[PDB]
Amino acid sequence: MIIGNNLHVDAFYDEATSTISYLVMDRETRQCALIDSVLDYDPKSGRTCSASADRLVERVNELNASVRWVLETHVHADHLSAAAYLKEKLGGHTAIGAHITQVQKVFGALFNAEPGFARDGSQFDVLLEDEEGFRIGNLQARALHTPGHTPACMSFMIEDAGEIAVFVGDTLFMPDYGTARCDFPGADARTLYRSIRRLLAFPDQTRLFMCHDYLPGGRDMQYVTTVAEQRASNIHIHQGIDEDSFVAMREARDKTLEMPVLILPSVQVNMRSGQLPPPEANGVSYLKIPLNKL
Amino acid sequence: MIIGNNLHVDAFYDEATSTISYLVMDRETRQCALIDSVLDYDPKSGRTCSASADRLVERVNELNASVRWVLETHVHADHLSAAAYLKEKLGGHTAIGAHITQVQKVFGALFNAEPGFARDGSQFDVLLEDEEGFRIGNLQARALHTPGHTPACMSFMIEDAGEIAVFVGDTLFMPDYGTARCDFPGADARTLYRSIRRLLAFPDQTRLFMCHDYLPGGRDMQYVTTVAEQRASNIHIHQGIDEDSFVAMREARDKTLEMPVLILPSVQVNMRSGQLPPPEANGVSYLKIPLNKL
Ligand SMILES: N[C@@H](CCC(=O)N[C@@H](CS)C(=O)NCC(=O)O)C(=O)O
Ligand SMILES: N[C@@H](CCC(=O)N[C@@H](CS)C(=O)NCC(=O)O)C(=O)O
Ligand SMILES: [Fe+3]
Ligand SMILES: [Fe+3]
Incomplete structure (x- = not known):
């Protein structure tokens, strides 16, 4: 799909993990970002x-594109990241939220990592701060720190032609x-509420691109919506739901969920920027x- | 169920792994064996x-029984053994096939085990040889080496009142x-054929107790049959099937199977007589x- 004139977005859906990965390209320079690869x-x-x-890889080549960024919104609990594999094949720089260091501290301890495992995010090329700008060719992007599902989660804003x-x-x-769970280490429902209200303060017509979609009640996969629709209709966090009410809901809901199948494999890889542990x-x-x- | 006069057998089925565990008691002395616990x-x-x-544990106490043996037919790929947990709770000796050492050698290397990991079966109390007798109270038992699914597999014969x-x-x-798969390390279809033909040379009325049952076509769980019925009707290895034909079938079938969900967790625990790796x-x-x- 094309947003504005030059914001090209392809969505790729992984059936096994329900992850939506993206190729985001500047139609002019052909520079691109790959987001949340599997x-x-x-x-x-x-x-x-x-x-x-x-x-x-095939889509980048079909487009005659050049990878500038390999991005991760967060340290995923449900799949392993392909960022290291893709940076090796395609080049570009990897980026993740600056609070990765807190995730590395916690999971370096949990997995009793080897004594060369860095806890300062140096496995990643770039650490992104709240509201920090970055470019995809002529496209202006901005990283937003939107924690709550994890302490480090980022959202990526991109604008073209208004x-x-x-x-x-x-x-x-x-x-x-609805919304994502808030029971992983360092997660917090109140924090997620506040992050979402920042996202929902964008203009009504703003397109919002999902990270997972779980085909509820067997509908077809969907990956994009708008601020206006979320504010009107999100079953967990529509405009009518206040912070306290959301927190009570989300916390009671989290108590009922099981661990993702791949949490332990995923985190210990993703905390290393998609590298397998050293042999x-x-x-x-x-x-x-x-x-x-x- | 009671075989003869004093051979008491309770079957316990685990839905998650389709394992059938057994409590086998001498009704006179109340001494018992627990087989393939989960x-x-x-x-x-x-x-x-x-x-x-x-x-x-509850069934042993309900019967006023005393555990003499905690047995494993083989190093299971589909579930973790509760033998160490049960020996601590109830006492008795653990036993496994003497060819455990070959399994330990192969999987000690695969999991790059710590140097204190013994490859001589010393984690187990007793190593059983082909046709070796053992007792469960007054019941005469005999271990039979029946490899093919693994190099170390044993069957346990018990006799009462003819x-x-x-x-x-x-x-x-x-x-x-049918029959078990023959693709795990050191498995062999020809060897399994020969093992089964030894088992099927027992008297027709001999009861045979299964280790797994997978409810084919949604039938209820079954765990016991006879030599006569296997020889007449087993879809893989009834009397009409020769060794070469079985081998071609079994080997072509194995090429289509996926790994058990718990193969990697299970074998690194079971190779240690049910202990978790050392912290x-x-x-x-x-x-x-x-x-x-x-
Ligand atoms: N069954 C899924 C669990 C996936 C999962 O928990 N996803 C997180 C995002 S990483 C979530 O928020 N699910 C939301 C919910 O179930 O309410 C799996 O094994 O992967
Ligand atoms: N889907 C099962 C696989 C179980 C399995 O492979 N069982 C073995 C015995 S340990 C077997 O022989 N299956 C034989 C067949 O399907 O022909 C699991 O995940 O545990
Ligand atoms: Fe997530
Ligand atoms: Fe098995």
């Missing part, structure tokens, strides 16, 4: 695969589905699954 | 739980379901998931 992972066998990522899009990560879902003396890399701890 | 494991969160095992039962592990399944310096135990190896 490295396929079979937890039964420990096998990774680049099939989903290769779709992005129209705005925001890639909101796991904050809002489609209006019929042991036998040449094999291992995920570590903490027992009776998470 | 320690519940949620791979998403890394949590173990003793719910299934506690069913056995009637025989055999707990066959993952060799035969019910006649309508690291932070006091947490971890499973190791080899990446891109299995």
